[model samples]
Target chain A: DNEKRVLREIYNHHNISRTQISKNLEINKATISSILNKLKYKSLVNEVILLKVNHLYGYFISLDLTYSSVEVMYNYFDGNVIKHESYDLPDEKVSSILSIIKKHIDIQEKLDTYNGLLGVSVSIHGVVDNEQHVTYLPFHETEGISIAKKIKEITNVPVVVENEANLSALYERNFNHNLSYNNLIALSIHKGIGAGLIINNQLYRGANGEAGEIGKTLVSKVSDNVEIFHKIEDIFSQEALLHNLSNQLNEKMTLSKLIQFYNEKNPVVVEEMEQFINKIAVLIHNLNTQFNPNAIYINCPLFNEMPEILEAIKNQFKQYSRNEIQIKLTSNVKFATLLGGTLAIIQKVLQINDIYLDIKA
Target chain B: PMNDNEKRVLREIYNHHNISRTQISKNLEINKATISSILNKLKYKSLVNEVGGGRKPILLKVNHLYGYFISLDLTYSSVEVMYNYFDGNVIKHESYDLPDEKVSSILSIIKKHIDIQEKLDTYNGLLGVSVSIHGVVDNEQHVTYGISIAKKIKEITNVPVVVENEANLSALYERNFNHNLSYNNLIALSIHKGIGAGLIINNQLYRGANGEAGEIGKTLVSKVSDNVEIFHKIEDIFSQEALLHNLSNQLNEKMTLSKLIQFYNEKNPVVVEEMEQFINKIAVLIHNLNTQFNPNAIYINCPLFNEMPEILEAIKNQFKQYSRNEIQIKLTSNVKFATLLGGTLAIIQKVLQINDIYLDIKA
Candidate 1:
């Protein structure tokens, strides 16, 4: 089980170097090297550039596919987005999408820095299964999609596929690497609600691939046998928020409207946001007693748009119990999905934690 | 089979290889008289052989090959009994439908199994008896319905007796199985008349303060309207009993899993809908468990999943929104005899110095 132990170690520590792996496991450096080399040869691992101040030899590619457009980004091994471009998704067909990807790969091939590409990853807004199968994509024709396989064929590089919320969690974990805690919960609130669980410093996917579906939970407290199943997403999802508030306010509901109404003490916004945060705190408390996580990260624009809403949630969290967990809002909003895609590629290659890695430019 | 204090003393002697009764008592902080009784009882089972007598009476050591272990499982479906050597080799196995599930009735079944074991020329004296039952059991293995039977069995058998929850035993069996070497943290969810879960954390069974940590059944799931909130225990909604109840109502006849599977095979819409809801609710629990402990693996011991493989496809579709990558989810390969085997496995660990991790069995 030594090789198994080595794989598990790399799975838990994405930031670990080859030498540190050898030292920590107390295996001979030669044995570590041999194992890592064999893993690399088997395409299970790769030697990548560690982030350094002056070095500039390595980079990786990321793909972000949404309903409207497909984005390609090049990031230095140091976790910085370097070159990026986007194209309109004229059609949702796989053939149509692959042409754009194939063109991008050809363009990279003409550049002298082409060989520096380490891997590639794709992030989608909807459900991507464990086998990298896009099982459900609400915005596009999720059927007949094997984007990861097609991209791998085109780029001739290691590829990974993941959900947008999961990548957000990885991005948050990478940003907070200095915290050094093993367990965290990342709640990605956007068009939908998804949870990212990190335990023992590794992402947790549950049996049947349905582990972090908090969006389905009933946020309303129950006292009778009425079968009204209003899920948390029914009240908190961005779509739900926009749908409910737009009709009430007689205007298009945006984050700005919610914040502006809250400032003006609008009952429609205040009561809804209040109830949302209260239920969130309840969910947090329940999760805390259950898992004892070190922190919870919220990846939502609502927190950044209205800091006071975050304050209310934090205060409510304290009301439930003054637990030591840090309820920090994620600040890495721009390229979170792109950065997470890059991280996912590295994580798959090394079989390590989904946390961020440092590669020099 | 022994109480925690008695087991502690026995393990202390096992670890030291030999120890005086007073040393065992002092090290374990139990009363000397209590230790003496525990030692005397252990000696009767041939687990401990007295040695080197003097006024102070200094030496005691474990008897490695003194006797065999016997385990009985009393689940909702049936009763299973397994007899094994002190080293954990299966001597005889038997199963029979329950005649009646009362203290004396179960005692008669236990006696019958013991008789079968004793009739074998290869049989040694019974070192311990372990009983596994459904539903919640305390640290002392006291269940709400079966505690009296466990005590009554010890009274009749005149040997060490242990009672444990079936789900807990199932988790032990799963964790100790050869196919599960990589995962130390796992959750075993057993679906029967009720839904019970057993957690293996940090490579050990974690029974909470009141032996209720893995009691996910008691958790509340709710539905809310403008005026009233409707709540029910997760088990009441997700249990095998609930599934049958719902299906029976839909079919206008009492239905069993086999019949339901047949109907499901025929694509009966009502049965299909009920099964979908059943799997969906179970998916919710799986998601909750995933967010909670973040165990590396989760195993479902349900006849429904075993009978119908297509349900996994439905579960997969429902799961897509929850997690990007699926955690390992599969039907337990050993649930039929796992409780009986697990009790024997526990006895081997507690009484005979054979831990599942290292112990090898012949035949």
Candidate 2:
């Protein structure tokens, strides 16, 4: 019975150690050891060195290639940043970008021989088709290219290519936020609103990898003519907020300034913020009615910097559904995507359903 | 050669034989590397096949020569049965109007099919049996009939029996045979005496926690009459039965779906008015679905939508309010055949240890 139980525990948590398994499941050390040995013998499970050893150096490589100035991040799997380099792409050539990527990866970290490269997963701001081809990357000319294949060619390691919002959603599902929320939507409010759907306790990328392209949704018809049509992103994104503030205030107003005005209770900031929150609430209500997800995670800069947006959106969502869909402002926006991408690489490499870690360690 | 995940993975490859390794890993929540190794093992076993050269993805498919299957569809009006090979070849099929729609009568119809199948060249090749019911089914495919008709059928046939919702089967048929293979998420709205929907999320039938995911008819939406607002469940206001009932009361005559379609084609004012209201309610439901699922396509299994082809255009024109890009919509070419074919597909899938039905009829 203990063998079976321990085997299941190890099977469920892919990168867990014998000691952690014994401690968490309250199984005897010898029983856990015996079960692990049987599992290893059966090839159903294995003891990965990187999983058990500390300071073994798990690499977190995340590249948001859509940005005009791409942010290439390097860190520990636990979100301890070693370096973050941002550079403007001079050309859309794969060769040039690969050179830049190689520079960052081939770094000067004075470490021991025990260091293990867990693998690399990169997040893109475009759609990745079933064939793992980059279909669309706005602000870049890299279409019909395979970043994953290119990276694999260079590193000879497995590379996972994911949409940024999707990576964020997976990160939230396994690492951050409420673990109970198996079905959640991680709505990324960058220049546009993109959603990563988690349904039936797994990432639901949809048939064409376009499951959560909520930005193109026609939320409201502002005018009678087709020219006057407005998408949810037109009113619900950071770009929308900044544009509205700029137009109304007759000056270039940033988020910090708006927050400053919001603190002073300026009518303009107060009114615009409420309007933005209400629209986001409508989007949330639509998501709630359709999926009935356990939570709707707001991973936008507006929600992250302005936590009150959640309260306002919640107030709006109250009219739609009785269920208190867990709403949260991402506490670690800088860390989520990279951490998720890192674990995705690990899980793929390890063949595990889930990976758990004590970040403090 | 392997364990539980391997068996399940083999079934997945068999079902979606043309799917890529990455797609499998994504859907199954397995790692890509894991899928890669599993595919190798399966290839070694001669159970899985890979097609195409170059980086376009080596499509994984099952050998169709594995076995055969049988399907039975019990509708309100008739009983349809089909005998098919695992590769989705229609060996034979038969249909009869059950003027006496009883359990015994249905069983007799099934027996006739079994007899016909027994005469076929691959009689002993039968692997599984699937039955499609035109009503709500539980997680175990048990319906309001209380007893497992599937179990009773199994006792006689001694084949692995599976009972499923006809609407869900129809959706599966559209997903496998008709619609764009890439449109993984889809909804098929079925209208009969009652209304039900089948949702294909991530290219599989997403029967919710209680097997009620696509019960869109019960979702409450607003309806206005004489400047007064009233909320009604979608099925109450828009289903075939609901439309016919309201139309019958107004015209003071019993009518059918065909009769209503004829009147609408002739541009009868009362018929047009009532049908317009029905269309509006249907539009509301569509808008909600588009908002919620963002499905690549939505298919209608109603007779009215099928016959009145221009109504889809009308719905699309009205759809600009809900979506920037026109949400792909179409009618199941033949609702009856879709349901029947889907039932057969399910049987073949189970028999082949597959997750989907992909028939290469063009060949």
Residues forming the 10-long window of minimal summed lDDT in candidate 1 chain A: A48-57
lDDT of 2 by residue, A147-216 (tens): 8888877666677888888877777777543366567788888788888877776777765576777776
Which consecutive 10 residues in model 2 chain B have the weakest lDDT in total? B354-363
DockQ of each: 0.08, 0.11
| lDDT of the candidates, in the order given | 0.68, 0.68
In model 1, pairs of residues that clash are A11-A352, A51-A358, A56-A361, A77-A359, A78-A359, A223-B229, A224-B229, A224-B230
TM-score of chain A of each: 0.77, 0.79
True contacts kept of each: 0.11, 0.12
Show how many residue pairs clash in every candidate, following the order shown: 8, 2
For model 2, how does the per-residue alpha-carbon lDDT over B209-321 read when each residue is reduced to its tens digit? 34555666655444335655344555776788889988999999998988898898899999998876677556656665665565778888887777777888777766655
**Model 2 stretches astray by more than 4 angstroms:** A1-60, A66-69, A75-103, A107-118, A143-146, A149-156, A176-180, A220-229, A351-353, A356-361, B1-169, B172-185, B189-197, B207-298, B309-330, B337-363
Error of 1 at B16 (Å): 31
lDDT for A92 in candidate 1 is 73
